[PDB]
Amino acid sequence: TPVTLAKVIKVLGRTGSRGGVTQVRVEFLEDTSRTIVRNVKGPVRENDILVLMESEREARRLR
Amino acid sequence: HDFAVTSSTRVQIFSSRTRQVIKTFSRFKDVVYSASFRSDGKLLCAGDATG
Amino acid sequence: IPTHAPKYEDRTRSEINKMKAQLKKERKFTMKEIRKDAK
Amino acid sequence: PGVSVRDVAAQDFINAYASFLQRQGKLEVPGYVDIVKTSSGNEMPPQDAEGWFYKRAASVARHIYMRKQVGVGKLNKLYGGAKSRGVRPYKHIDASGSINRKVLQALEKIGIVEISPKGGRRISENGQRDLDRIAAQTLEEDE
Amino acid sequence: KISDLENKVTVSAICRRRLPVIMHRLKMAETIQDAVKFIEQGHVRVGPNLINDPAYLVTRNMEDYVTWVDNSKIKKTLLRYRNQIDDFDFS
Amino acid sequence: PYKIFKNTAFIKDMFSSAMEVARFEGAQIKTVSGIRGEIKRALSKPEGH
Amino acid sequence: FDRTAKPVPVITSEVTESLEDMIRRRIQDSNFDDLQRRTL
Amino acid sequence: RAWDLIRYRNFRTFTGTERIQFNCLAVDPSGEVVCAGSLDNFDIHVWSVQTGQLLDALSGHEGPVSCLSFSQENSVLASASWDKTIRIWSIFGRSQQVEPIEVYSDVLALSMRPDGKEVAVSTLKGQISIFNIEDAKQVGNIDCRKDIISGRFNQDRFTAKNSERSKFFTTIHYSFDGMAIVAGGNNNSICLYDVPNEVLLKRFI
Amino acid sequence: RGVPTSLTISHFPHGPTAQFSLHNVVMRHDIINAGNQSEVNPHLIFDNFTTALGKRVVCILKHLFNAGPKKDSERVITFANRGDFISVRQHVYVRTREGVEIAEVGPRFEMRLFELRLGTLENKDADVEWQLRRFIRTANKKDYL
Amino acid sequence: AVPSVQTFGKKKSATAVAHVKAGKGLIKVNGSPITLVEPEILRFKVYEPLLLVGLDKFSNIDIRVRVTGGGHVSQVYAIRQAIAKGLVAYHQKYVDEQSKNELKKAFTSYDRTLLIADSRRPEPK
Amino acid sequence: LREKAKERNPDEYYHAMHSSMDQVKLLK
Amino acid sequence: DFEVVEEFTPVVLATPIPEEVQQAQTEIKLFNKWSFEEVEVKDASLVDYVQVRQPIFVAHTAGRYANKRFRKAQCPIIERLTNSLMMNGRNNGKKLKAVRIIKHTLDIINVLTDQNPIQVVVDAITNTGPREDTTRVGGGGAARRQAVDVSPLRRVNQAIALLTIGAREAAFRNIKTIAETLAEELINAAKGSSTSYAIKKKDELERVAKSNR
Amino acid sequence: DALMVMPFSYVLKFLKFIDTVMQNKTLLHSHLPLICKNLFFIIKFNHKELVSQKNEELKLQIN
Amino acid sequence: VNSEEKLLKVIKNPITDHLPTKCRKVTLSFDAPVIRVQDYIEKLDDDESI
Amino acid sequence: SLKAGERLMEA
RNA sequence: CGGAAGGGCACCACCAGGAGUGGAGCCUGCGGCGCGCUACACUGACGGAGCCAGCGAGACCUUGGCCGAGAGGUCUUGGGAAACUCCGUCGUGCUGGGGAUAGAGCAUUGUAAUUAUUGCUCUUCAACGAGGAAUUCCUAGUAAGCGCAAGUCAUCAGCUUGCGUUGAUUACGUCCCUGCCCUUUGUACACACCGC
């Protein structure tokens, strides 16, 4: 199965999200154009590559 | 310099330059049937009487 | 499979246990009493 | 070129000196060697009852030689481990001073240790030379 | 007070504020004249910078921060008497 | 007294029971050298200690 | 016999009643010490 | 004191209540906070600009703080004090957290890389070290005790050679490339070192 | 044995230390899940502070509690002294339509200062400013000592 | 006199006194070799500076070390710190300062605690 | 002695920082 | 062609220094047994979270890694594994036992699969590093599982603790020892054999994640 | 941050919306500087993605 | 009375914490459509604990 | 009650 | 009096972990509630071997010698803890983890030991098979574990207070919830922002 990777561009704080839940803009490591706002749980900083199964979906708010 | 001999519920590795008991495997329940070394001189197999 | 029977609700050891429980309980009772009266 | 027990390791020299005294045989092993618990805080006698006394003698000699002169009481405090009280917590305990006296009188019979001023037992010149030789043998045991 | 300035400021006050009295005060040298000699030899140092004139009034912070100059024979025999030489710091 | 510390003493054979000690506990005491103190707590393992 | 030191007082309903009435008085009066900020 | 350079007017004379004698100072890159570090107090006093009042006075330094610097990029502070130490503080984002660094002697000079991950420091021994900030690990040092032309005094009783007068460096500056260094202390010299080869480049009497 | 009985307070700029034995501890954890404290800067109520020793005490406690409270700080603390036994309880309070109404909350106990030293606690050797005399003639009778 | 220096390695409660001089290539941990350290698995840990920097000046140089205080871990860390400090002291004083800088930057590149001490000073929040 | 131990001041420089059985006794 | 001459005397030591030691000075290896090259990460997005490039003999460096936020990533991975395995009340802070059991496990893995035990470690870690996890949305009461991603740091920590716990329970009340069972679990997760509790756990997590994605 | 969080699809929608009010200049004259400021933050934020992108209708919009 | 084991064991919630992994869970409903027990168990998988 | 940015997105 | 907004803070919030308690036994503080101790074994038990600290100095503590398995006692002399490391043994069995009880024997203290004052030796080998409802607490030399020393006016002796050793997992972000607090006159001074 094809698995894609995406490096963090910019962390997104001050939003209304559940504790532990992190909301992060990433860019496709393959194609530097595409930027998708997904969600990451663990402790993370900027400009590190992440793993992804589904690409077309973007992780929305979780109250 | 070493060789294993099966025995009563026990495998005995003897030396050659000394010809003395170096190791005694006795974790078995009944009498060991076979004792064979690997091609790399580290891992040995002991066929038992339990199958 | 072997069925089992539950118990629910040494004679010398049981009466030793009951007697020593009596000693401990009665002793601490009188000790707290006499401590309160002394203070 | 001149070596000693401070240069050789502990366990290898102890077991080798035990086996050397075993093949010597001139030690006068006592009669209750297979009944003593070697301490009161222990639970079982030594498992290998064949050479535990020789190991003890080698370890005592090594301790004296690393030291200079000792008493039976100081060796007893050294060899004494911790006891297991059970329901209560644990505390320190001491070993068999009779066993230490048997070892010490045996080594004094052989002549490796001897009586010592200000009180004690010390290593002899012949005994020190023998320790030096068996240290050389144990280090050149690698053929 | 104001009487403390109108009365208590002395030549002795400014003289004990002088440096070799402070060295003899902190027992840097056993005597004040040997403190002066250490000042001349520059075996001391006053915070960031060492010193060479005894005619010096020391601010309280530099009084807390005055000591010997590094790699000096005097501090070396200090650490030799204390048997705590650390040649890593060329002490 | 059969065991003493700095400002502390362990005293036996004054009472028959720790109950007697508790009936007389927390109390002003002094001794023949004239010196003061207080009985505070019974010792549990012996009776009048 | 005699005792050596003051007894530790055990606290009763009447004691805490008198206390809380004293508190009610001090707060009705609003009179109570505070660490007010130093002026200037 | 905070001043204009276009209307040319003092904005604010920030002061401590005791008015302690600030030596070192650093300013926020966006210009929101100002910090001053004295010698008698060695407590880092920090004011906001528009408030005019102090926000805080950081402690943790024992003995006077030689110098202060702000890594503008991550915008944190390094404070070098005569406890032979550095102490880096991150003060925003509910952090208020600390990273101390022991060095071998009392530091008296401090500066940061214009990129903001390495830091150069000059101590009394004359060695100028460099540290990665994030791992807080020494990048590496350059000796300076040898290449110092100190001068002799007329009232000297020793030589100019055996004098410990200016065997360190008191002020340093980075190249804006972060590859050269201009260092100047109490001596008669101004030196120019290189970062990657860790060698000097030039000495001007 | 898990029973709090001693509390020492030291002032860090080389300040004094107040050594108390606290006994009659009643904890909110022990009593109920009553909720949480308001954590507003509380009001202070000192009672029966007569001697200059008591003046030093009220100075120390006034200064350990935070400066400049709100006039409408709705939790109040008490400092109730009697028989040389200071005792304290947390009190939130409101005024009624006519009078006042309080709720005792927080802790509840009796402590007693058995020592006051000039230096800090890590001294253990600095000059004691006030020492309790247990072994004296008038010990169960003398107040403020 | 003999070119010799003396340093210390100081851990939690472990102090190690080191005496360094030009010698025949012997290292004596309390009269025993460095091959006779106690825990038998931190032998590599105490070996670290020697194999880090090479064996030649250690053939040139004899060191005697005597250690007091601290547990086993504190002891061995104080020991290897004392080794590094004594060797850099000797190679500063009697040997070249340039080579001193080389071994210094190498030891700082691997592990600075051989040079400087790690003081776990407490912090409040 | 404890107070003088606390204020040892380890930078003092004093100038004094630079200084059969009967058969054995007869020998010595 | 060209050469440098740098050694000029045969280095003789009055303290007898062994041959493995005089080869370890040439190349540091782990337990002086396994080299530090040819152990590279097989997958992106986990490099620089895995730090293996710095050589060592034993994983007992006392470097303070408990202060910053990524010092755990800067830490040598074997040291973190030891800190993880020494996690029981009867095992709190027993680092020499930890190092010895690690040495045993590495010998056993090098016996079974002779390639490299530390490379088997790296591969099993990268294998069982999970990819998606479902948080519990409270939903005002409708607490359901909603799948999002996971930081590679957390992937690392969870994989380490997962293999740690798996070996722990595997040799908990069992005649086999912790060292050999951790060898087996490590080979299992290096295979992605799915008979390992760690791989099964990560698989069912990402299964639930793909379900309620 | 509420301008930071938006994905580029919504960014593109916003550009079309700017084009629409640019037709409706009269409404633009009511909130022109706000319009400029948010537009500028948008383009400065997402600049690399859009400049890697290509769309001639978007080009004409910008013109 | 054999003292071999605790038999009736009060355990921790939940049942899912005390269930096997490959697992099918069914509730008998009076409204849900009828099935056959033998046909259901035979159509079940091999390593499944119903 | 929604969040800003989200509200801007849906509007 | 209420509503609304904005901001901040919280191991009484979110989030990640850890560690206990509550299950067995023992001790101890409360009238059936609480605080600790020992176990539930293989990272374990046992036997040898090796040995690394610190706090503590108002007929007492002792170097050494003697015998006694031991407990012990004797004559003389002055005023180096455990956990840990190696080897071996055991091995998955309420088994050798666990030591509860009981008997027997030997020694010391005390008038007298009897209801074993106390220690030791052997035999007897129970419960406990990792602790439900739940519970708490916490972000580095931390939790934890280990042992050592002193009781030095309150309080403490199967207990308090000091001391050393070893030593971590996971956060170090967020107000999303749980609250709780602040603001909703820039007032203040450049430039910018904002503008009931």
CSV table of C-alpha atoms in Angstrom, one decimal, chain M residues 2 10, chain O residues 4-5:
chain,number,residue,atom,x,y,z
M,2,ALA,CA,-7.9,32.7,12.0
M,10,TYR,CA,-10.6,28.5,1.0
O,4,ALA,CA,-13.3,32.2,14.4
O,5,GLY,CA,-11.6,31.1,11.2
